[PDB]
Design a protein around this ligand. Sequence first.
Ligand code: HEM
Ligand code: HEM
Ligand SMILES: Cc1cc(N)nc(CCc2cc(F)cc(CC[C@H]3CCCN3)c2)c1
Ligand SMILES: Cc1cc(N)nc(CCc2cc(F)cc(CC[C@H]3CCCN3)c2)c1
Ligand SMILES: Cc1cc(N)nc(CCc2cc(F)cc(CC[C@H]3CCCN3)c2)c1
Ligand SMILES: Cc1cc(N)nc(CCc2cc(F)cc(CC[C@H]3CCCN3)c2)c1
Ligand SMILES: [Cl-]
Ligand SMILES: [Cl-]
Ligand SMILES: [Gd]
Ligand SMILES: [Gd]
Ligand SMILES: [Zn+2]
Ligand SMILES: [Zn+2]
Ligand SMILES: [Zn+2]
Lengths: 402, 404
Amino acid sequence: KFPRVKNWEVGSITYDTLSAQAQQDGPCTPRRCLGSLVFPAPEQLLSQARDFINQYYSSIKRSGSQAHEQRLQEVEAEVAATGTYQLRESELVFGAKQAWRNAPRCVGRIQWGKLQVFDARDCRSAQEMFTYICNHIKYATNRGNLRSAITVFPQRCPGRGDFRIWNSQLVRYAGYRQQDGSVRGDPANVEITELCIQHGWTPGNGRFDVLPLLLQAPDEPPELFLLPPELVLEVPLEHPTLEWFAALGLRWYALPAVSNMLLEIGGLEFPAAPFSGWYMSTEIGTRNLCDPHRYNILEDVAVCMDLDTRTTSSLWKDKAAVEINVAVLHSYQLAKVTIVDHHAATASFMKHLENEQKARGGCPADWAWIVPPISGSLTPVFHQEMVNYFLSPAFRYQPDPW
Amino acid sequence: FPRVKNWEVGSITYDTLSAQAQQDGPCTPRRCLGSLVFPRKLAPEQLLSQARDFINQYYSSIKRSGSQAHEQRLQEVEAEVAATGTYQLRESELVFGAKQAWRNAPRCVGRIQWGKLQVFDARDCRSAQEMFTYICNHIKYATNRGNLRSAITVFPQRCPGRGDFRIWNSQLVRYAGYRQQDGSVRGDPANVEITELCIQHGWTPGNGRFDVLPLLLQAPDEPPELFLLPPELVLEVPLEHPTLEWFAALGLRWYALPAVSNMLLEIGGLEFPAAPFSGWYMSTEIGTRNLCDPHRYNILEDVAVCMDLDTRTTSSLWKDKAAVEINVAVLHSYQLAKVTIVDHHAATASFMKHLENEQKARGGCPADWAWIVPPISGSLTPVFHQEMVNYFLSPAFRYQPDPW
Ligand code: HEM
Ligand code: HEM
Ligand SMILES: Cc1cc(N)nc(CCc2cc(F)cc(CC[C@H]3CCCN3)c2)c1
Ligand SMILES: Cc1cc(N)nc(CCc2cc(F)cc(CC[C@H]3CCCN3)c2)c1
Ligand SMILES: Cc1cc(N)nc(CCc2cc(F)cc(CC[C@H]3CCCN3)c2)c1
Ligand SMILES: Cc1cc(N)nc(CCc2cc(F)cc(CC[C@H]3CCCN3)c2)c1
Ligand SMILES: [Cl-]
Ligand SMILES: [Cl-]
Ligand SMILES: [Gd]
Ligand SMILES: [Gd]
Ligand SMILES: [Zn+2]
Ligand SMILES: [Zn+2]
Ligand SMILES: [Zn+2]
């Protein structure tokens, strides 16, 4: 009773034996599927640890060995003495890559083995935290030739508060409410904008103002840090044939760096471990610029394209959306900033599924997030059945610290 | 009671209808199988319990529970089963059940129309030639010279032992799929299997790329016979593009009527292996799936060449550009031919309205996100940012085996 999985474009059939090792539970039952939902002491800690150590010593082709049982013994002992334990640096690097490998909504996982892991577990203050983060952005950005990286700040521990980054990403544009009641800038960031302001930030008045970082050291209020402007690489948006497009004044930033998730490794939790890769072009063109509740530029673009916005059957929305994505891809290519289109991304993810089926006998994947938000059935992932389940190590959502 | 959020507007509801479900779906707390096309794979004490439930919701809907003529229908059904083991549906229950099965179909985006359904009762049928005449009435009525009307024809229910009425084609109108020299196909690769059962039962093959296949109708026990569809009864649309002069030269056509003829209508514990239903097309069905799927007519590159697109790099979005124009041509061609069609923007906006209606009426609506979101421009439609709950209600259209 392993789930049969078929690709309907090709006829391929595989069975997902890895789903049976699903170490935690999701929102569905045989009664009802909730898959489309966005948001779905020593004893428990010890069994998560053993399982991880077992994964680690499996990875280095040394399972059941002297060093393996030694480490198992050491951890049980350390959990007894201290209520927790510390990862070796090599185990941390393995745990970070596994968390990415296990991330079911990530279409970029072909890259999972090429992750740069910065060990900031010795961080002591928000000021030091800032320095680490500035170094992360600099290395990952690499002048436009982007590299995947994660920085791990100290784990959660009894008796002390968490390191937390309040910003959902290291680079975000501000969202300012208006007299029209409207939002100027990115409506997704209204809340964090208001927090920065009341923590002493002097707001701008533009549409693409980079937000400061609110960094929280254990048992301190958050501290405001401005990003040096020369650290935040940005791409002005132009279209290769639509010359008035450059006159919209649109821009986006190079580095997508998610900073508000919790990294979990062997029962240990790291509430602050921001990670970054590079953008797939629909994230910018379709979601960030075209969503009605984001920058919502679609109608303004279609009107300038001289399209008939009076009826839906002319597909003015689809035509304007495609050209916005073309503009994104062309602009990042022009600027020499890494970018991947959804055709290339989904093709590599299909190679990733093949690799994972041989390696682990399956691959956790969230169809609704893996299939891009435009041209879905034109990509190979559309016709591929997928099994969604939760493996550890893992990135998890966590509540906002405020 | 699942919380259900719309991330575009921020509105919240609670799906209370989900609790009243349950033919068991495929998901478990440890793994979601929501993307699987077939939920896994395919002494009558429980016939009564399914009939009582159905009868109860028929009288619920007509303001008529607790007094009444519903207690009397309750007893005639159990006397009927106590006597013959099965039972016959009143004609209005049959109408009510057919509409409820459509209303309950999680994968159907067109359900705002679920109240306008023409139900032809064909249970007194007994010959495959009769069937062909029923099917021919339906098609004629449903087509209505291009002003399509939703319709289902309900054939005799499966009964203890005996045999099955069964249409063998997957739809009433299907184009031919001829394998070949290369192991390649001319026509529709989706219909290769049935194109060969047609010829192995006596059909003379045809031209190629757009040959309406003949019907394979199976009366109980008796083996299936072939029937030719009159070209007068099969309305078709030549595809042309409003501004791309050469598009008509590609010789593309599609048919007017989508009529699913292989699913099993189940009402109150009764099974109807032959109950073809029909509506009208959403344009992405034709242009995106049927014409552009790599395993269907696979025309994307041909159109891209004619548009002189940069097919040498994926980042030109030449697939995306070509695909939109094929959809523009589908819509324009149906409109010019005055054949009812609906685009995915209009269709999903109507579905959002359906969701609002269903929340007031029944406290929710089973919906399959992966099938409700259109196959192109998903996030541009209002259903993309709408969370949905999938579950099985009865009456339903179910998948069923294939008599091969
Ligand atoms: C290197 C290139 C990468 C690409 C192209 C990529 C792509 C994506 C995309 C497209 C999504 C969400 C679907 C969407 O927004 O349309 C996503 C989600 C995600 N990615 Fe990747 N990613 C990359 C690197 C990484 C790295 C380095 C990590 C962690 C080490 C990671 C972990 C995740 C996680 C956890 C999610 C889900 C986030 C959430 O649910 O909020 N990704 N990725
Ligand atoms: C009248 C206009 C109708 C429209 C526009 C429509 C549209 C659709 C679409 C678009 C799908 C599949 C999703 C996709 O391919 O993207 C679908 C599936 C379905 N529809 Fe509707 N439909 C209509 C009428 C009907 C009627 C009259 C019935 C039944 C009486 C029905 C029952 C179903 C069922 C059972 C499915 C699922 C089929 C399967 O699982 O293979 N629909 N419909
Ligand atoms: C490292 C990385 C690279 C990349 N190229 N892309 C991403 C995904 C960015 C992203 C995409 C989304 F679609 C939504 C979010 C925020 C998700 C919040 C909302 C609900 C739960 N978490 C972030 C991450
Ligand atoms: C993962 C996935 C998601 C989605 N949203 N859609 C699909 C394809 C649905 C589909 C459409 C068709 F048009 C035909 C088939 C298979 C029919 C074959 C199998 C047996 C007999 N005929 C499947 C797959
Ligand atoms: C009445 C009606 C109107 C309309 N406008 N559209 C449809 C949908 C036709 C359709 C769409 C699909 F996407 C797949 C199928 C058949 C595939 C089989 C294999 C597995 C499940 N069904 C049929 C039906
Ligand atoms: C049903 C559905 C399917 C899908 N495939 N995608 C979505 C949108 C998911 C999404 C993307 C974003 F980019 C941002 C959010 C909300 C983030 C809010 C919550 C808390 C803080 N910000 C949600 C919805
Ligand atoms: Cl983003
Ligand atoms: Cl079809
Ligand atoms: Gd131009
Ligand atoms: Gd060319
Ligand atoms: Zn599920
Ligand atoms: Zn969106
Ligand atoms: Zn398809």
